[PDB]
Coordinates of C-alpha atoms and ligand atoms in Angstrom, one line a residue:
Chain A
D267 CA -18.5 -1.7 -4.3
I268 CA -19.8 -4.9 -5.7
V269 CA -22.1 -6.8 -3.2
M270 CA -22.0 -10.6 -3.1
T271 CA -25.3 -12.2 -1.9
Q272 CA -24.7 -15.8 -0.9
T273 CA -27.5 -18.2 -0.2
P274 CA -28.4 -20.3 1.7
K275 CA -27.0 -19.2 5.1
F276 CA -27.0 -22.8 6.5
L277 CA -27.3 -26.3 5.1
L278 CA -27.9 -29.6 6.8
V279 CA -27.0 -32.6 4.7
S280 CA -26.2 -36.3 5.1
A281 CA -22.9 -37.8 3.9
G282 CA -23.3 -38.8 0.3
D283 CA -25.9 -36.1 -0.6
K284 CA -25.5 -33.0 -2.8
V285 CA -24.8 -29.4 -1.7
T286 CA -25.8 -26.4 -3.9
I287 CA -24.7 -22.9 -2.8
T288 CA -25.5 -19.7 -4.8
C289 CA -23.7 -16.4 -5.0
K290 CA -25.1 -13.4 -6.8
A291 CA -23.2 -10.3 -7.6
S292 CA -24.8 -6.8 -7.6
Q293 CA -23.2 -6.4 -11.1
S294 CA -21.7 -8.8 -13.6
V295 CA -18.2 -9.9 -12.7
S296 CA -17.3 -12.1 -15.7
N297 CA -16.0 -15.4 -14.3
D298 CA -13.9 -13.6 -11.6
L299 CA -15.4 -15.7 -8.8
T300 CA -13.5 -17.7 -6.3
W301 CA -14.8 -20.2 -3.8
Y302 CA -13.2 -20.9 -0.4
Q303 CA -13.7 -23.3 2.4
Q304 CA -13.1 -22.4 6.0
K305 CA -13.0 -25.3 8.5
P306 CA -13.5 -24.4 12.2
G307 CA -10.4 -22.8 13.7
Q308 CA -8.7 -22.5 10.3
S309 CA -7.8 -20.0 7.7
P310 CA -9.8 -20.1 4.4
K311 CA -8.7 -22.7 1.8
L312 CA -9.1 -21.9 -1.9
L313 CA -11.1 -24.5 -3.8
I314 CA -12.3 -23.0 -7.1
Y315 CA -11.2 -19.9 -9.1
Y316 CA -12.4 -18.4 -12.4
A317 CA -15.8 -19.7 -11.3
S318 CA -15.1 -23.3 -12.4
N319 CA -11.3 -24.2 -12.1
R320 CA -10.3 -26.5 -9.3
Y321 CA -7.2 -25.5 -7.4
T322 CA -4.3 -28.1 -7.3
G323 CA -5.3 -31.2 -5.4
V324 CA -9.0 -30.2 -4.8
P325 CA -11.2 -33.3 -5.2
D326 CA -13.5 -33.9 -8.2
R327 CA -16.7 -33.7 -6.0
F328 CA -16.3 -29.8 -5.9
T329 CA -17.6 -28.0 -9.0
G330 CA -18.5 -24.4 -9.8
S331 CA -20.3 -22.6 -12.7
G332 CA -21.5 -19.2 -13.8
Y333 CA -20.6 -16.0 -15.8
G334 CA -22.0 -12.6 -15.0
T335 CA -24.0 -12.2 -11.8
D336 CA -25.1 -15.7 -10.9
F337 CA -22.8 -18.4 -9.6
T338 CA -23.3 -22.0 -8.4
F339 CA -21.0 -24.1 -6.2
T340 CA -21.7 -27.8 -5.9
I341 CA -20.4 -30.6 -3.7
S342 CA -21.6 -33.7 -5.7
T343 CA -21.3 -36.3 -2.8
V344 CA -20.7 -34.5 0.5
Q345 CA -18.2 -36.1 2.8
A346 CA -18.0 -35.8 6.6
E347 CA -14.7 -33.9 6.3
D348 CA -16.5 -31.2 4.2
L349 CA -18.2 -29.5 7.1
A350 CA -17.2 -25.8 6.9
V351 CA -18.3 -22.3 6.0
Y352 CA -18.0 -21.7 2.2
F353 CA -17.5 -18.2 0.9
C354 CA -17.4 -16.7 -2.6
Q355 CA -15.2 -13.7 -3.6
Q356 CA -15.3 -11.5 -6.7
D357 CA -12.3 -9.7 -8.0
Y358 CA -13.7 -8.2 -11.2
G359 CA -14.2 -4.9 -9.4
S360 CA -12.0 -3.1 -7.0
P361 CA -12.1 -3.7 -4.1
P362 CA -12.5 -7.5 -4.1
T363 CA -15.5 -8.4 -2.0
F364 CA -16.8 -11.6 -0.4
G365 CA -20.1 -13.2 0.3
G366 CA -21.4 -13.7 3.8
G367 CA -20.8 -17.4 3.8
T368 CA -22.8 -20.7 3.9
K369 CA -22.4 -23.1 6.9
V370 CA -22.5 -26.7 5.9
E371 CA -23.4 -29.1 8.7
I372 CA -23.6 -32.9 8.5
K373 CA -26.6 -35.0 9.4
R374 CA -25.8 -38.5 10.8
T375 CA -27.5 -41.3 12.8
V376 CA -28.4 -40.7 16.4
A377 CA -25.5 -41.2 18.8
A378 CA -25.9 -41.0 22.6
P379 CA -23.4 -39.0 24.7
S380 CA -20.9 -40.6 27.0
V381 CA -21.2 -38.6 30.3
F382 CA -18.5 -37.7 32.7
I383 CA -18.4 -35.5 35.8
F384 CA -15.5 -33.7 37.4
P385 CA -15.4 -32.3 41.0
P386 CA -13.5 -29.0 41.6
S387 CA -9.7 -29.4 42.2
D388 CA -8.3 -28.8 45.7
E389 CA -6.1 -26.2 44.0
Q390 CA -9.2 -24.3 42.9
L391 CA -10.9 -24.6 46.3
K392 CA -7.9 -23.1 48.0
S393 CA -8.8 -19.9 46.0
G394 CA -12.4 -19.6 47.1
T395 CA -14.4 -20.9 44.1
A396 CA -15.6 -24.3 43.0
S397 CA -16.2 -25.2 39.3
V398 CA -18.0 -28.5 38.7
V399 CA -17.8 -29.8 35.1
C400 CA -20.1 -32.2 33.3
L401 CA -18.9 -33.5 29.9
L402 CA -21.1 -34.9 27.1
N403 CA -18.8 -36.6 24.7
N404 CA -19.4 -37.5 21.0
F405 CA -23.2 -37.2 20.5
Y406 CA -25.7 -36.4 17.7
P407 CA -27.8 -34.5 17.4
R408 CA -26.7 -31.3 19.1
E409 CA -30.0 -30.9 21.2
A410 CA -29.4 -32.1 24.8
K411 CA -30.7 -31.1 28.2
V412 CA -28.1 -31.0 31.0
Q413 CA -29.4 -30.4 34.5
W414 CA -27.4 -29.8 37.7
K415 CA -28.8 -31.1 41.0
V416 CA -27.2 -30.3 44.3
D417 CA -28.5 -32.5 47.1
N418 CA -31.2 -33.4 44.5
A419 CA -32.2 -29.7 44.1
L420 CA -32.4 -28.7 40.5
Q421 CA -30.2 -25.7 40.0
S422 CA -30.6 -22.7 37.8
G423 CA -28.7 -19.5 36.9
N424 CA -25.3 -20.9 38.1
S425 CA -24.2 -22.9 35.1
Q426 CA -22.9 -22.2 31.6
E427 CA -22.6 -24.6 28.6
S428 CA -20.3 -24.7 25.6
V429 CA -20.6 -26.9 22.5
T430 CA -17.7 -27.9 20.1
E431 CA -18.0 -27.5 16.4
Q432 CA -19.1 -30.7 14.7
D433 CA -16.2 -33.3 14.5
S434 CA -14.8 -33.7 11.0
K435 CA -14.5 -37.5 11.3
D436 CA -17.6 -38.8 13.1
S437 CA -19.8 -35.7 12.7
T438 CA -20.6 -35.7 16.5
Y439 CA -20.7 -32.8 19.0
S440 CA -19.4 -32.6 22.5
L441 CA -20.6 -30.2 25.3
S442 CA -19.4 -29.0 28.6
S443 CA -21.6 -27.7 31.4
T444 CA -19.8 -25.8 34.2
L445 CA -21.6 -25.2 37.6
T446 CA -19.9 -22.4 39.5
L447 CA -20.3 -22.0 43.2
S448 CA -18.4 -20.2 46.0
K449 CA -16.3 -22.5 48.2
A450 CA -18.7 -21.7 51.1
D451 CA -21.8 -22.8 49.1
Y452 CA -20.0 -25.8 47.7
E453 CA -19.2 -26.9 51.2
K454 CA -22.8 -26.7 52.3
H455 CA -23.8 -29.7 50.2
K456 CA -22.9 -33.3 49.7
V457 CA -24.3 -34.7 46.4
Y458 CA -23.4 -33.1 43.0
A459 CA -25.2 -34.6 40.0
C460 CA -25.2 -33.9 36.3
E461 CA -28.4 -35.3 34.6
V462 CA -28.5 -35.7 30.8
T463 CA -31.5 -36.1 28.5
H464 CA -30.8 -36.9 24.9
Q465 CA -32.7 -38.5 22.0
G466 CA -30.1 -41.3 21.9
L467 CA -30.6 -42.3 25.5
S468 CA -33.5 -44.6 26.5
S469 CA -33.8 -42.6 29.7
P470 CA -31.8 -39.8 31.4
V471 CA -28.3 -40.6 32.5
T472 CA -27.0 -39.2 35.8
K473 CA -23.4 -38.9 36.9
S474 CA -22.7 -37.8 40.4
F475 CA -20.2 -37.6 43.3
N476 CA -20.3 -37.1 47.0
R477 CA -18.2 -34.1 48.2
Chain B
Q155 CA 6.2 -25.5 1.5
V156 CA 4.8 -22.0 1.3
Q157 CA 4.1 -20.6 4.8
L158 CA 2.8 -17.2 6.0
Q159 CA 3.6 -16.8 9.8
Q160 CA 1.7 -14.0 11.6
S161 CA 2.5 -12.3 14.9
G162 CA 0.5 -13.2 18.0
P163 CA -2.8 -11.9 19.3
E164 CA -2.9 -8.3 20.6
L165 CA -4.8 -6.5 23.3
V166 CA -4.8 -2.8 22.5
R167 CA -6.3 0.3 24.0
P168 CA -8.7 2.5 22.0
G169 CA -7.0 5.5 20.3
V170 CA -3.7 3.6 20.1
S171 CA -2.1 2.0 17.0
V172 CA -1.1 -1.6 16.5
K173 CA 1.4 -3.1 14.1
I174 CA 1.0 -6.7 13.1
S175 CA 3.4 -8.8 11.0
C176 CA 3.4 -11.5 8.4
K177 CA 6.6 -13.4 7.5
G178 CA 6.6 -15.4 4.3
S179 CA 8.8 -18.4 3.7
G180 CA 9.1 -21.2 1.2
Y181 CA 9.0 -19.0 -1.9
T182 CA 10.7 -15.9 -3.2
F183 CA 9.1 -13.3 -0.9
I184 CA 9.7 -10.2 -3.1
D185 CA 8.0 -11.9 -6.1
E186 CA 4.4 -12.1 -4.9
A187 CA 1.7 -9.6 -3.8
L188 CA 0.7 -9.8 -0.2
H189 CA -2.9 -9.0 0.7
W190 CA -4.6 -8.3 4.1
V191 CA -8.1 -9.4 5.0
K192 CA -10.3 -8.6 8.0
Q193 CA -12.7 -11.1 9.5
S194 CA -15.2 -9.9 12.1
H195 CA -18.7 -10.7 13.3
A196 CA -20.0 -7.4 11.8
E197 CA -18.9 -7.9 8.2
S198 CA -17.6 -11.5 7.5
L199 CA -14.5 -11.1 5.2
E200 CA -13.3 -7.7 4.0
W201 CA -10.3 -7.0 1.8
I202 CA -8.1 -4.2 3.3
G203 CA -5.4 -3.8 0.6
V204 CA -2.4 -5.2 -1.2
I205 CA 1.3 -4.5 -1.2
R206 CA 3.6 -5.4 -4.1
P207 CA 7.1 -5.9 -2.6
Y208 CA 8.8 -6.0 -6.0
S209 CA 7.6 -2.4 -6.7
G210 CA 6.5 -1.0 -3.3
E211 CA 3.1 -0.3 -4.8
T212 CA 0.2 -0.3 -2.4
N213 CA -3.5 -0.3 -3.1
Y214 CA -5.9 0.2 -0.3
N215 CA -9.6 -0.4 0.0
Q216 CA -11.0 3.2 0.3
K217 CA -12.8 2.0 3.5
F218 CA -9.4 1.5 5.2
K219 CA -7.6 4.4 3.6
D220 CA -7.4 6.3 7.0
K221 CA -7.0 3.2 9.1
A222 CA -4.4 1.0 7.5
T223 CA -0.8 1.3 6.4
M224 CA 1.0 -1.5 4.7
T225 CA 4.8 -1.8 4.6
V226 CA 7.3 -4.5 4.0
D227 CA 10.9 -5.4 5.1
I228 CA 12.4 -7.4 2.2
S229 CA 15.5 -8.3 4.3
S230 CA 13.4 -10.2 6.8
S231 CA 10.7 -11.3 4.3
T232 CA 8.1 -9.6 6.5
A233 CA 5.0 -7.5 5.7
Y234 CA 3.5 -5.3 8.3
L235 CA 0.0 -3.9 8.7
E236 CA -0.4 -0.9 11.0
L237 CA -4.0 0.0 12.2
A238 CA -4.2 3.5 13.6
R239 CA -6.6 5.1 16.1
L240 CA -8.3 1.9 17.1
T241 CA -11.9 1.6 18.1
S242 CA -14.0 -1.4 19.0
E243 CA -14.9 -1.8 15.3
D244 CA -11.2 -2.8 14.7
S245 CA -11.6 -5.9 16.9
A246 CA -11.3 -8.8 14.5
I247 CA -9.0 -11.4 13.1
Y248 CA -6.6 -10.1 10.5
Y249 CA -5.1 -12.4 7.9
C250 CA -2.3 -11.9 5.4
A251 CA -2.6 -13.9 2.2
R252 CA -0.7 -14.2 -1.0
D253 CA -1.8 -14.5 -4.6
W254 CA 0.2 -16.4 -7.2
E255 CA -0.3 -14.0 -10.1
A256 CA -3.5 -15.8 -11.5
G257 CA -5.7 -13.0 -10.2
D258 CA -6.5 -11.3 -6.9
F259 CA -7.4 -14.4 -4.9
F260 CA -5.4 -16.3 -2.4
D261 CA -3.9 -19.8 -2.1
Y262 CA -1.8 -19.3 1.1
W263 CA -3.1 -17.5 4.2
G264 CA -1.5 -16.7 7.5
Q265 CA -3.1 -18.3 10.6
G266 CA -4.7 -15.0 11.5
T267 CA -3.9 -12.4 14.3
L268 CA -6.7 -11.7 16.8
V269 CA -6.9 -8.0 17.7
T270 CA -9.0 -7.1 20.7
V271 CA -9.5 -3.4 21.3
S272 CA -10.3 -2.7 25.0
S273 CA -9.4 -0.6 28.1
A274 CA -9.3 -3.7 30.3
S275 CA -6.0 -5.1 31.4
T276 CA -4.8 -8.5 30.3
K277 CA -5.4 -11.3 32.8
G278 CA -3.8 -14.7 32.4
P279 CA -5.7 -17.9 33.2
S280 CA -5.7 -20.2 36.2
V281 CA -5.3 -23.8 35.0
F282 CA -7.0 -26.5 37.1
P283 CA -7.0 -30.3 36.6
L284 CA -10.1 -32.1 35.6
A285 CA -9.0 -35.3 37.4
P286 CA -10.1 -38.7 36.0
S287 CA -11.6 -41.1 38.5
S288 CA -12.4 -44.0 36.0
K289 CA -11.1 -47.4 36.9
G290 CA -16.4 -48.4 30.3
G291 CA -13.6 -48.7 27.8
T292 CA -12.6 -45.1 28.1
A293 CA -11.5 -42.4 30.6
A294 CA -11.9 -38.7 30.3
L295 CA -9.6 -36.0 31.7
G296 CA -9.0 -32.3 31.1
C297 CA -7.9 -28.9 32.1
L298 CA -10.1 -26.0 33.2
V299 CA -8.6 -22.7 31.9
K300 CA -10.4 -20.2 34.0
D301 CA -10.6 -16.3 34.3
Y302 CA -8.6 -14.8 31.4
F303 CA -8.8 -11.8 29.1
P304 CA -8.7 -11.3 26.2
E305 CA -9.2 -14.2 23.8
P306 CA -7.5 -16.4 22.6
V307 CA -5.9 -19.2 24.5
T308 CA -4.3 -22.3 23.0
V309 CA -4.3 -25.8 24.6
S310 CA -2.2 -28.7 23.5
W311 CA -1.7 -32.0 25.2
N312 CA 1.7 -33.7 25.8
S313 CA 3.2 -30.9 23.7
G314 CA 1.2 -31.8 20.6
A315 CA 1.9 -35.5 20.9
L316 CA -1.8 -36.2 21.8
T317 CA -4.4 -35.0 19.3
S318 CA -7.0 -37.8 18.9
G319 CA -9.9 -37.6 21.3
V320 CA -9.1 -34.0 22.3
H321 CA -11.9 -31.5 22.6
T322 CA -11.1 -27.8 23.5
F323 CA -14.4 -26.1 24.0
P324 CA -15.2 -22.5 22.8
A325 CA -14.7 -20.0 25.7
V326 CA -17.7 -18.6 27.5
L327 CA -17.6 -15.0 28.7
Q328 CA -18.5 -15.0 32.4
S329 CA -20.5 -12.2 34.1
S330 CA -17.1 -11.1 35.5
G331 CA -16.1 -10.0 32.0
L332 CA -13.5 -12.8 31.9
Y333 CA -13.4 -15.9 29.7
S334 CA -13.3 -19.6 30.8
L335 CA -12.9 -22.8 28.9
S336 CA -12.2 -26.5 29.4
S337 CA -10.1 -28.8 27.2
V338 CA -10.7 -32.5 27.6
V339 CA -9.4 -35.7 26.2
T340 CA -10.7 -39.3 26.4
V341 CA -8.1 -42.0 26.6
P342 CA -8.5 -45.8 26.9
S343 CA -8.7 -46.4 30.7
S344 CA -5.8 -48.9 30.7
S345 CA -3.5 -45.9 29.9
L346 CA -3.9 -44.1 33.2
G347 CA -0.4 -44.3 34.8
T348 CA 0.9 -46.0 31.6
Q349 CA 1.0 -42.5 30.1
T350 CA 1.4 -39.0 31.8
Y351 CA -1.0 -36.3 30.8
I352 CA -0.1 -32.6 30.7
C353 CA -2.1 -29.8 29.2
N354 CA 0.0 -27.0 27.7
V355 CA -1.9 -23.7 28.0
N356 CA -0.7 -20.5 26.3
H357 CA -2.2 -17.1 26.8
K358 CA 0.0 -14.9 24.7
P359 CA -1.5 -11.5 25.7
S360 CA -0.5 -12.0 29.4
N361 CA 2.7 -14.0 28.5
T362 CA 1.1 -16.9 30.5
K363 CA 2.4 -20.4 29.8
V364 CA 1.2 -23.3 32.0
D365 CA 2.1 -27.0 31.6
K366 CA -0.3 -28.6 34.1
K367 CA -0.1 -32.3 35.1
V368 CA -3.4 -34.1 35.4
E369 CA -3.5 -37.2 37.6
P370 CA -6.0 -39.4 39.3
Chain C
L216 CA -2.6 -2.6 -33.3
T217 CA -5.7 -2.9 -31.1
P218 CA -5.3 -4.4 -27.5
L219 CA -7.4 -7.4 -26.7
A220 CA -10.4 -6.7 -24.4
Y221 CA -10.6 -8.3 -21.0
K222 CA -11.5 -12.0 -21.2
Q223 CA -11.3 -11.9 -25.1
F224 CA -9.7 -14.8 -26.9
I225 CA -8.4 -15.0 -30.4
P226 CA -9.4 -16.9 -32.5
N227 CA -12.9 -16.6 -31.2
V228 CA -13.3 -20.4 -30.6
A229 CA -12.3 -22.7 -27.7
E230 CA -8.6 -23.3 -27.2
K231 CA -8.5 -27.0 -28.0
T232 CA -10.6 -26.8 -31.2
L233 CA -9.1 -27.4 -34.7
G234 CA -9.0 -23.7 -35.6
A235 CA -7.1 -22.8 -32.4
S236 CA -4.4 -24.9 -30.6
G237 CA -6.1 -28.2 -31.2
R238 CA -6.6 -31.3 -29.1
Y239 CA -4.9 -32.2 -25.8
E240 CA -2.9 -35.4 -26.6
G241 CA -1.8 -36.1 -23.0
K242 CA 0.3 -35.0 -20.1
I243 CA 4.1 -35.0 -20.6
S244 CA 6.0 -35.9 -17.4
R245 CA 9.7 -35.8 -16.9
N246 CA 10.1 -39.6 -17.8
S247 CA 8.0 -39.4 -21.0
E248 CA 9.4 -40.3 -24.4
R249 CA 7.6 -37.1 -25.4
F250 CA 9.7 -35.2 -22.8
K251 CA 12.6 -35.3 -25.3
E252 CA 10.3 -33.1 -27.6
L253 CA 10.6 -30.3 -25.1
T254 CA 13.7 -28.1 -25.2
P255 CA 14.6 -25.1 -22.9
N256 CA 14.4 -21.5 -24.0
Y257 CA 17.3 -19.4 -22.5
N258 CA 16.6 -16.2 -24.5
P259 CA 18.2 -13.5 -22.3
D260 CA 15.4 -11.1 -23.2
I261 CA 12.7 -13.2 -21.7
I262 CA 12.2 -13.2 -18.0
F263 CA 11.1 -16.5 -16.5
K264 CA 9.5 -16.3 -13.1
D265 CA 10.5 -19.9 -12.3
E266 CA 7.9 -20.3 -9.6
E267 CA 9.0 -23.8 -8.7
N268 CA 12.8 -23.1 -8.9
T269 CA 13.3 -26.1 -11.3
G270 CA 13.7 -24.3 -14.7
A271 CA 10.6 -26.2 -15.8
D272 CA 8.9 -23.1 -17.2
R273 CA 11.6 -22.9 -19.9
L274 CA 10.8 -26.3 -21.4
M275 CA 8.5 -26.0 -24.3
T276 CA 7.7 -27.3 -27.8
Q277 CA 9.5 -26.1 -30.9
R278 CA 6.5 -24.0 -32.1
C279 CA 6.2 -22.5 -28.6
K280 CA 9.8 -21.3 -28.6
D281 CA 9.4 -19.9 -32.1
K282 CA 6.3 -17.8 -31.2
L283 CA 7.7 -16.9 -27.8
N284 CA 10.9 -15.7 -29.3
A285 CA 9.0 -13.6 -31.9
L286 CA 7.0 -12.0 -29.1
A287 CA 10.2 -11.1 -27.1
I288 CA 11.3 -8.9 -30.0
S289 CA 8.0 -7.1 -30.4
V290 CA 7.6 -6.5 -26.6
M291 CA 11.0 -4.8 -26.5
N292 CA 10.1 -2.8 -29.6
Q293 CA 6.7 -1.8 -28.1
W294 CA 8.1 -0.6 -24.8
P295 CA 11.9 0.2 -24.7
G296 CA 13.4 -1.2 -21.4
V297 CA 10.6 -3.7 -21.0
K298 CA 10.8 -7.4 -21.7
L299 CA 8.4 -10.4 -22.1
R300 CA 7.9 -12.3 -18.9
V301 CA 6.7 -15.9 -18.5
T302 CA 4.9 -16.7 -15.2
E303 CA 4.0 -20.3 -16.0
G304 CA 5.0 -22.7 -18.8
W305 CA 5.3 -26.5 -18.7
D306 CA 3.7 -28.0 -15.6
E307 CA 5.0 -31.3 -14.3
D308 CA 3.0 -31.2 -11.0
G309 CA -0.7 -30.7 -11.9
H310 CA -1.2 -26.9 -11.1
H311 CA -3.9 -26.6 -13.8
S312 CA -7.3 -27.9 -14.7
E313 CA -6.7 -31.3 -16.4
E314 CA -6.2 -31.3 -20.1
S315 CA -4.3 -28.0 -19.8
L316 CA -1.9 -27.4 -22.7
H317 CA 0.7 -26.5 -20.0
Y318 CA 1.0 -30.2 -19.4
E319 CA 2.3 -30.6 -23.0
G320 CA 4.7 -27.7 -23.0
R321 CA 2.6 -25.9 -25.5
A322 CA 1.2 -23.0 -23.3
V323 CA 2.6 -20.0 -21.4
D324 CA 1.1 -17.4 -19.1
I325 CA 2.9 -14.1 -19.7
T326 CA 3.2 -10.5 -18.5
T327 CA 5.5 -7.7 -19.1
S328 CA 8.7 -7.5 -17.0
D329 CA 7.5 -4.4 -15.2
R330 CA 4.2 -6.1 -14.2
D331 CA 2.2 -3.1 -15.5
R332 CA -1.3 -4.6 -15.9
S333 CA -2.3 -1.7 -18.2
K334 CA 0.1 -3.2 -20.9
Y335 CA -1.4 -6.7 -20.9
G336 CA -4.2 -6.1 -23.5
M337 CA -1.5 -4.8 -25.9
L338 CA 0.8 -7.7 -24.9
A339 CA -2.0 -10.1 -25.9
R340 CA -2.3 -8.4 -29.3
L341 CA 1.5 -8.8 -29.7
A342 CA 1.1 -12.5 -28.9
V343 CA -1.5 -12.9 -31.7
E344 CA 0.8 -11.0 -34.2
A345 CA 3.7 -13.2 -33.1
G346 CA 1.7 -16.2 -34.3
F347 CA 0.4 -17.9 -31.1
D348 CA -2.5 -20.2 -32.2
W349 CA -4.6 -19.1 -29.2
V350 CA -4.4 -16.0 -27.1
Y351 CA -6.7 -15.4 -24.0
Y352 CA -6.8 -12.3 -21.8
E353 CA -7.5 -14.7 -19.0
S354 CA -7.1 -12.3 -16.0
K355 CA -5.9 -8.9 -15.0
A356 CA -2.7 -10.7 -13.8
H357 CA -1.7 -12.5 -17.0
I358 CA -2.3 -13.4 -20.7
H359 CA -2.6 -17.1 -21.6
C360 CA -1.0 -18.2 -25.0
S361 CA -0.8 -21.6 -26.6
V362 CA 0.3 -23.3 -29.9
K363 CA -0.7 -26.3 -31.9
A364 CA 1.2 -29.6 -31.5
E365 CA 4.1 -30.3 -33.7
Ligands
CL582 CL1 -22.2 -42.8 30.0
CL583 CL1 -16.3 -41.3 24.7
CL584 CL1 -33.4 -33.7 24.6
CL585 CL1 -13.9 2.1 21.4
CL586 CL1 11.2 -3.9 -16.1

């Protein structure tokens, strides 16, 4: 089976700059090389086939080259909407095989998060657990410190964070941190605070509520 | 408009078989080859095989010879992939995809069917409001979709009417072995009681559908 | 007769050069004055896939019909019960790299009716002998043939 080695694994690039991705086959595969783009959540979308032919409607900024083992995919002037994993595929040999992919991430100016906190619902409390949610909305870059404080005590081991894929319009991220306590523990304390440190903030932003 | 519509996500026990479906519309079904592709953590994308409805010819990747069977029902424009004797290595997204007779590469893909192989029972989510209390130019609200298994869940707002400003976070696996996520949306704060906000949660493996109203 | 090899083109020069099918003059669309130069091929012994369900694949130049019609005969002679098949002809909707001769009704992608890929190298040779100005074994799934402009 033909092995497709794709490099690099990851790319960080500003809107307007060039992207160069390489795929090398373990044996020559003519020009039987296809490039796809998979945006987050979505099925792959075909961009280039026969190494260099653009599919119907694919913008001019995407090109491809090569014949034999070594193939080059270029985005001439990368756009915000171009964030995705790109994959090559050969079909010279049977079975068709794919490369391992290249993730293309956008660099943009610093953007501070807007911060929001949400107490647990009464509905949830009825059931014996309290989830407290802190939301960091539309920020860049991804690195952020989110600290929970209960009656001004810094918590650890009782929260989990999740981060969105980069937004295809504004190239920001968003993050949720969820603090999970038993109803009993929740009811022992008054002040619940989410404290956020981020490069875009002059100093840490705290959102809080009193139970 | 060419469309490939696949069947929903599947929780399946090890040792059992699963049959998933792909219905083609917007072109002459019998005329084109239909391919199946597996996407997992382990191996990125792998081609499983192809079925040619016009001839009934099948070609399998040797790696799936003993795992996969491809069939088609011309009368319903539906291709089927049966995966037998499932182990955890079969957990993955499975896509169908068509070629257009330019070569064995694929313009139209299904949306993917997520197959989770596990002995655990399905569990549908509890859906809790993330209540706004903002009266800044913008308010945030959401739904906590807590304690479900397996993946995936979908979340829409106002039945797909609201899409801008929506963020549905990747699920996290809790220590309990159950998933949890939040879906949030920011809305100009003037529109809080000028528009109603309902999150529509679907967890197909448990046949759970919740339309939860989020209010101040 | 010797089959063409995979990815072989005859003559051994680029399609749009003078010794082959010559220059791309420009896209013909349904309103064109040049649209009148295209006429439909309804040869009953040629299968047209008609991907778009418009009949567009049948519209082609005079020279294209002549060569295609010759090929239809030689295909049936080569493999009794099998016929020439056209997968793509004139393109009104930009399904090709720009400057494709499909935009001028001067190029077809072809198979045999039975979609037996092992026949396609021989089908390509038949296309050469039928007088197509450029023949390219472009993929396992089809042969690309074109003709000079009128
Ligand atoms: Cl803020
Ligand atoms: Cl915001
Ligand atoms: Cl930081
Ligand atoms: Cl297992
Ligand atoms: Cl036949």
